[PDB]
Write a protein that holds these residues in place. Structure first.
Motif, PDB file in Angstrom:
ATOM      1  N   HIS A  52       0.901  -1.144   0.000  1.00  0.00           N
ATOM      2  CA  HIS A  52       0.000   0.000   0.000  1.00  0.00           C
ATOM      3  C   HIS A  52       0.944   1.199   0.000  1.00  0.00           C
ATOM      4  CE1 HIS A  52      -3.033   2.941   0.696  1.00  0.00           C
ATOM      5  NE2 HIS A  52      -2.661   3.212   1.960  1.00  0.00           N
ATOM      6  N   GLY A  53       0.866   2.044  -1.023  1.00  0.00           N
ATOM      7  CA  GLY A  53       1.735   3.199  -1.159  1.00  0.00           C
ATOM      8  C   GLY A  53       1.210   4.175  -2.197  1.00  0.00           C
ATOM      9  N   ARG A  54       2.074   5.084  -2.659  1.00  0.00           N
ATOM     10  CA  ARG A  54       1.730   6.084  -3.665  1.00  0.00           C
ATOM     11  C   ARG A  54       2.843   6.163  -4.706  1.00  0.00           C
ATOM     12  NH1 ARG A  54      -0.507  11.526  -4.023  1.00  0.00           N
ATOM     13  NH2 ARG A  54      -0.682  11.766  -6.303  1.00  0.00           N
ATOM     14  N   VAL A  55       2.516   6.590  -5.929  1.00  0.00           N
ATOM     15  CA  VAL A  55       3.464   6.702  -7.040  1.00  0.00           C
ATOM     16  C   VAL A  55       3.392   8.101  -7.678  1.00  0.00           C
ATOM     17  CG1 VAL A  55       4.067   5.527  -9.277  1.00  0.00           C
ATOM     18  CG2 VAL A  55       3.295   4.173  -7.371  1.00  0.00           C
ATOM     19  N   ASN A  56       4.490   8.531  -8.303  1.00  0.00           N
ATOM     20  CA  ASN A  56       4.678   9.798  -9.004  1.00  0.00           C
ATOM     21  C   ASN A  56       4.572   9.471 -10.493  1.00  0.00           C
ATOM     22  OD1 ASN A  56       4.920  12.012  -7.194  1.00  0.00           O
ATOM     23  ND2 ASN A  56       6.977  12.530  -7.813  1.00  0.00           N
ATOM     24  N   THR A  57       3.378   9.607 -11.077  1.00  0.00           N
ATOM     25  CA  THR A  57       3.094   9.322 -12.490  1.00  0.00           C
ATOM     26  C   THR A  57       4.097   9.961 -13.468  1.00  0.00           C
ATOM     27  OG1 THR A  57       1.252   9.428 -14.126  1.00  0.00           O
ATOM     28  CG2 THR A  57       1.305  11.177 -12.522  1.00  0.00           C
ATOM     29  N   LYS A  58       4.733  11.083 -13.108  1.00  0.00           N
ATOM     30  CA  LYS A  58       5.714  11.777 -13.945  1.00  0.00           C
ATOM     31  C   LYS A  58       6.883  10.903 -14.390  1.00  0.00           C
ATOM     32  CE  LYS A  58       4.585  16.256 -14.367  1.00  0.00           C
ATOM     33  NZ  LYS A  58       5.320  17.171 -13.474  1.00  0.00           N
ATOM     34  N   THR A  59       7.230   9.869 -13.631  1.00  0.00           N
ATOM     35  CA  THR A  59       8.347   8.990 -13.972  1.00  0.00           C
ATOM     36  C   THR A  59       8.082   7.542 -13.534  1.00  0.00           C
ATOM     37  OG1 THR A  59      10.740   8.763 -13.413  1.00  0.00           O
ATOM     38  CG2 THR A  59       9.491  10.198 -11.997  1.00  0.00           C
ATOM     39  N   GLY A  60       7.130   7.337 -12.620  1.00  0.00           N
ATOM     40  CA  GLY A  60       6.753   6.040 -12.086  1.00  0.00           C
ATOM     41  C   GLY A  60       7.423   5.765 -10.745  1.00  0.00           C
ATOM     42  N   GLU A  61       8.178   6.716 -10.191  1.00  0.00           N
ATOM     43  CA  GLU A  61       8.868   6.580  -8.917  1.00  0.00           C
ATOM     44  C   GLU A  61       7.863   6.420  -7.784  1.00  0.00           C
ATOM     45  OE1 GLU A  61      11.148  10.188  -8.977  1.00  0.00           O
ATOM     46  OE2 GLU A  61      12.899   9.229  -9.865  1.00  0.00           O
ATOM     47  N   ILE A  62       8.248   5.667  -6.760  1.00  0.00           N
ATOM     48  CA  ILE A  62       7.421   5.403  -5.596  1.00  0.00           C
ATOM     49  C   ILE A  62       7.654   6.535  -4.578  1.00  0.00           C
ATOM     50  CG2 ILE A  62       6.941   3.615  -3.821  1.00  0.00           C
ATOM     51  CD1 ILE A  62       8.384   1.664  -5.957  1.00  0.00           C
ATOM     52  N   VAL A  63       6.713   6.733  -3.660  1.00  0.00           N
ATOM     53  CA  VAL A  63       6.778   7.745  -2.612  1.00  0.00           C
ATOM     54  C   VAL A  63       7.138   7.043  -1.300  1.00  0.00           C
ATOM     55  CG1 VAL A  63       5.327   9.458  -1.365  1.00  0.00           C
ATOM     56  CG2 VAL A  63       5.095   9.194  -3.836  1.00  0.00           C
ATOM     57  N   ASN A  64       7.945   7.693  -0.456  1.00  0.00           N
ATOM     58  CA  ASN A  64       8.363   7.186   0.851  1.00  0.00           C
ATOM     59  C   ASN A  64       7.092   6.926   1.666  1.00  0.00           C
ATOM     60  OD1 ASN A  64       9.353   6.908   3.580  1.00  0.00           O
ATOM     61  ND2 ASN A  64       9.431   9.103   3.802  1.00  0.00           N
ATOM     62  N   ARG A  65       6.773   5.652   1.920  1.00  0.00           N
ATOM     63  CA  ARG A  65       5.592   5.231   2.669  1.00  0.00           C
ATOM     64  C   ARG A  65       5.956   4.110   3.644  1.00  0.00           C
ATOM     65  NH1 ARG A  65       2.375   9.059   1.697  1.00  0.00           N
ATOM     66  NH2 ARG A  65       3.712   9.180   3.574  1.00  0.00           N
ATOM     67  N   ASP A  66       5.073   3.847   4.601  1.00  0.00           N
ATOM     68  CA  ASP A  66       5.203   2.823   5.631  1.00  0.00           C
ATOM     69  C   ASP A  66       5.307   1.440   4.981  1.00  0.00           C
ATOM     70  OD1 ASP A  66       4.227   5.183   7.237  1.00  0.00           O
ATOM     71  OD2 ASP A  66       3.944   3.661   8.802  1.00  0.00           O
ATOM     72  N   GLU A  67       6.209   0.607   5.494  1.00  0.00           N
ATOM     73  CA  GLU A  67       6.505  -0.755   5.042  1.00  0.00           C
ATOM     74  C   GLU A  67       5.753  -1.835   5.839  1.00  0.00           C
ATOM     75  OE1 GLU A  67      10.890  -1.061   4.262  1.00  0.00           O
ATOM     76  OE2 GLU A  67      10.657   1.129   4.191  1.00  0.00           O
ATOM     77  N   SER A  68       4.725  -1.469   6.604  1.00  0.00           N
ATOM     78  CA  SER A  68       3.934  -2.420   7.394  1.00  0.00           C
ATOM     79  C   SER A  68       2.840  -3.106   6.566  1.00  0.00           C
ATOM     80  CB  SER A  68       3.314  -1.712   8.599  1.00  0.00           C
ATOM     81  OG  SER A  68       3.126  -0.319   8.397  1.00  0.00           O
ATOM     82  N   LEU A  69       2.609  -2.621   5.348  1.00  0.00           N
ATOM     83  CA  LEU A  69       1.620  -3.122   4.408  1.00  0.00           C
ATOM     84  C   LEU A  69       2.380  -3.544   3.161  1.00  0.00           C
ATOM     85  CD1 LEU A  69      -1.184  -0.464   4.979  1.00  0.00           C
ATOM     86  CD2 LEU A  69      -1.264  -2.878   5.612  1.00  0.00           C
ATOM     87  N   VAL A  70       3.102  -4.659   3.262  1.00  0.00           N
ATOM     88  CA  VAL A  70       3.917  -5.244   2.204  1.00  0.00           C
ATOM     89  C   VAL A  70       3.666  -6.756   2.237  1.00  0.00           C
ATOM     90  CG1 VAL A  70       6.278  -5.358   1.268  1.00  0.00           C
ATOM     91  CG2 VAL A  70       5.658  -3.378   2.637  1.00  0.00           C
ATOM     92  N   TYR A  71       3.641  -7.410   1.071  1.00  0.00           N
ATOM     93  CA  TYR A  71       3.400  -8.843   0.947  1.00  0.00           C
ATOM     94  C   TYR A  71       4.291  -9.470  -0.119  1.00  0.00           C
ATOM     95  CZ  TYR A  71      -0.796  -7.853   3.728  1.00  0.00           C
ATOM     96  OH  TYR A  71      -1.708  -7.492   4.667  1.00  0.00           O
ATOM     97  N   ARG A  72       4.421 -10.801  -0.075  1.00  0.00           N
ATOM     98  CA  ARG A  72       5.237 -11.591  -0.992  1.00  0.00           C
ATOM     99  C   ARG A  72       4.345 -12.380  -1.936  1.00  0.00           C
ATOM    100  NH1 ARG A  72       5.942 -13.133   4.214  1.00  0.00           N
ATOM    101  NH2 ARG A  72       7.459 -11.439   3.879  1.00  0.00           N
ATOM    102  N   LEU A  73       4.783 -12.508  -3.184  1.00  0.00           N
ATOM    103  CA  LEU A  73       4.087 -13.206  -4.253  1.00  0.00           C
ATOM    104  C   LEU A  73       4.991 -14.335  -4.738  1.00  0.00           C
ATOM    105  CD1 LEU A  73       2.481 -10.545  -3.925  1.00  0.00           C
ATOM    106  CD2 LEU A  73       2.923 -10.098  -6.284  1.00  0.00           C
ATOM    107  N   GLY A  74       6.084 -13.964  -5.409  1.00  0.00           N
ATOM    108  CA  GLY A  74       7.043 -14.900  -5.954  1.00  0.00           C
ATOM    109  C   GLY A  74       8.479 -14.523  -5.625  1.00  0.00           C
ATOM    110  N   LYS A  75       9.337 -15.538  -5.576  1.00  0.00           N
ATOM    111  CA  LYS A  75      10.755 -15.445  -5.277  1.00  0.00           C
ATOM    112  C   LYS A  75      11.559 -16.078  -6.416  1.00  0.00           C
ATOM    113  CE  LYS A  75      12.893 -18.324  -2.664  1.00  0.00           C
ATOM    114  NZ  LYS A  75      13.194 -19.234  -1.542  1.00  0.00           N
ATOM    115  N   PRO A  76      11.956 -15.291  -7.424  1.00  0.00           N
ATOM    116  CA  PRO A  76      12.736 -15.780  -8.554  1.00  0.00           C
ATOM    117  C   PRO A  76      14.186 -16.057  -8.153  1.00  0.00           C
ATOM    118  CG  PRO A  76      12.632 -13.413  -8.681  1.00  0.00           C
ATOM    119  CD  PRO A  76      11.730 -13.858  -7.546  1.00  0.00           C
ATOM    120  N   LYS A  77      14.981 -16.565  -9.096  1.00  0.00           N
ATOM    121  CA  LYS A  77      16.388 -16.853  -8.871  1.00  0.00           C
ATOM    122  C   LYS A  77      17.191 -15.624  -9.252  1.00  0.00           C
ATOM    123  CE  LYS A  77      18.055 -20.143  -7.721  1.00  0.00           C
ATOM    124  NZ  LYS A  77      18.433 -20.593  -6.364  1.00  0.00           N
ATOM    125  N   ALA A  78      18.470 -15.638  -8.898  1.00  0.00           N
ATOM    126  CA  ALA A  78      19.350 -14.523  -9.196  1.00  0.00           C
ATOM    127  C   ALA A  78      19.889 -14.586 -10.622  1.00  0.00           C
ATOM    128  CB  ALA A  78      20.512 -14.530  -8.211  1.00  0.00           C
TER     129      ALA A  78
END
Length: 162
Positions: A52-78
């Motif tokens: 859960h966060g916000r984005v700057n449509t001008k370039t697609g950059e993310i905004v500094n937001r709280d990391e308590s609302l983060v989840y995992r989907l997939g874990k690819p290889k290096a």
């Protein structure tokens, strides 16, 4: 009659060309998509997360937001060789399917939060790679699409906007 030997070579070429192109276009910078209240972030062989966060449509950059609302989907290889890709096609044209599991099992259904990424040719053959759409189809399974300009060079992928 005739043979279609070259078709199999073209398939092998489009798949390999596709993998190196995808990684080359993502290695430079990751890609994200703001799906309403939630955002989805995909990095070059690192992880796939939703927050859960916000984005700057001008370039697609993310905004500094709280990391308590983060989840995992997939874990690819290096490494690109540690993973495996699939050259598919549908009624429209060709694409490359990439599925990524090892998230957190959805106790609500008893399935994996693994994500499916579909690499296709982008309308702007002169722009960076980015996600087209995002939709959590099932409760755990999530589907996404990614556009790349360099993929459109490959004749198999010379179809989109249909």
């Amino acid at each position: 009659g005739a043979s279609n030997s070259e078709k199999t070579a073209l398939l092998t070429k489009t798949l390999n060309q596709g993998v190196k192109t995808i990684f080359d276009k993502l290695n430079e910078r990751c890609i994200f998509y703001q799906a309403g209240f939630w955002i989805y972030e995909y990095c070059p062989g690192i992880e796939f997360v939703q927050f859960h966060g916000r984005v700057n449509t001008k370039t697609g950059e993310i905004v500094n937001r709280d990391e308590s609302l983060v989840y995992r989907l997939g874990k690819p290889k290096a490494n690109v060789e540690e993973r495996e890709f699939e050259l598919l096609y549908d009624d429209v044209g060709y694409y490359i399917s990439e599925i990524i599991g090892s998230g957190d099992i959805c106790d609500v259904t008893g399935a994996e939060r693994m994500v499916e990424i579909q690499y296709v040719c982008g309308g702007s053959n002169s722009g960076p790679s980015t996600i087209q759409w995002v939709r959590e189809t099932k409760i755990c399974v999530y589907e996404a699409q990614v556009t790349i300009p360099e993929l459109c060079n490959l004749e198999l992928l010379a179809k989109n906007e249909d």
